[PDB]
């Protein structure tokens, strides 16, 4: 079985925890327990990745200097784990079904960076275009963290994911970036970039 590198594991941990925080906020904004459950599942993936990272890091150091260097990696992974656990604490609030103070959703919709729901209409030029080909993060500033398609969720969709009419995109970005993508998704804006 092909071994992974410390960097591959590290990159997945970093990418994953970022997705987790975004999804944690999304679960609070929409009071969505399925999103919240995904966060807890990602928390488990982070623990597994952290374990592999420690296994690799331990085995990779044989002398003092190497040891000192692998320790810096473990220290950062520990910080990532702290963030992962914090995101899990937010998701747990949603799973418990507590009544959220109204300012919470408002805060999520009004910060420098926000979470937004974007409905894709049939006439939108993005229909039929995969995420890889579109790369919305790059071309629109709107980062897609999940997609609701009917009765199913696609979390952290890759480049092989193709957008369809009816899809509901969950994005993270500035308010103006979100309103802009909504116009594109509606069909009002026929041009992308
Ligand atoms: Cl690598
Ligand atoms: Cl379609
Ligand atoms: Na060692
Ligand atoms: Na739909």
From TrEMBL:
The keyword Isomerase does not apply. Ca(2+) 2 binds at residues 58, 61. GO terms for biological process: potassium ion transport. Ca(2+) 4 binds at residue 151. Ca(2+) 3 binds at residue 82. One of its GO terms (molecular function) is monoatomic cation transmembrane transporter activity. Keywords: Calcium, Metal-binding. It holds the Pfam family PhoU. It comes from the Archaea. Residues 103-187 form the RCK C-terminal domain. Ca(2+) 1 binds at residues 47, 81. PROSITE patterns: RCK_C. The keyword rRNA processing does not apply. Ca(2+) 5 binds at residue 166. PANTHER family: K(+)_H(+) ANTIPORTER SUBUNIT KHTT. This is RCK C-terminal domain-containing protein.
């Amino acid at each position: 079985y092909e071994p992974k590198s410390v960097k591959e594991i590290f990159i997945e941990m970093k990418d994953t925890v970022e997705l987790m925080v975004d999804l944690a906020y999304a679960s609070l904004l929409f009071g969505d327990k399925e999103i919240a459950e995904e966060v807890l599942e990602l928390e488990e993936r982070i623990d597994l990745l952290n374990y592999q990272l420690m296994m690799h890091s331990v085995l990779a150091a044989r002398n003092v200097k190497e040891a000192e260097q692998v320790i810096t990696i473990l220290q950062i992974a520990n910080a990532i784990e702290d963030i992962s656990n914090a995101a899990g604490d937010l998701a747990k609030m949603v799973l418990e079904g507590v009544e959220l103070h109204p300012v919470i959703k408002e805060t999520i919709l009004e910060g420098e960076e926000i979470i937004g729901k974007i409905q894709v209409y049939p006439e939108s030029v993005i229909v039929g275009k995969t995420l890889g080909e579109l790369d919305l993060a790059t071309n629109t500033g709107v980062w897609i963290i999940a997609v609701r398609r009917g009765k199913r969720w696609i979390f952290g969709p890759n480049e092989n994911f193709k957008i369809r009419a009816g899809d509901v995109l969950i994005g993270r970005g500035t308010r103006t970036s979100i309103d802009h993508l909504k116009e594109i998704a509606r069909g009002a804006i026929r041009v992308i970039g």
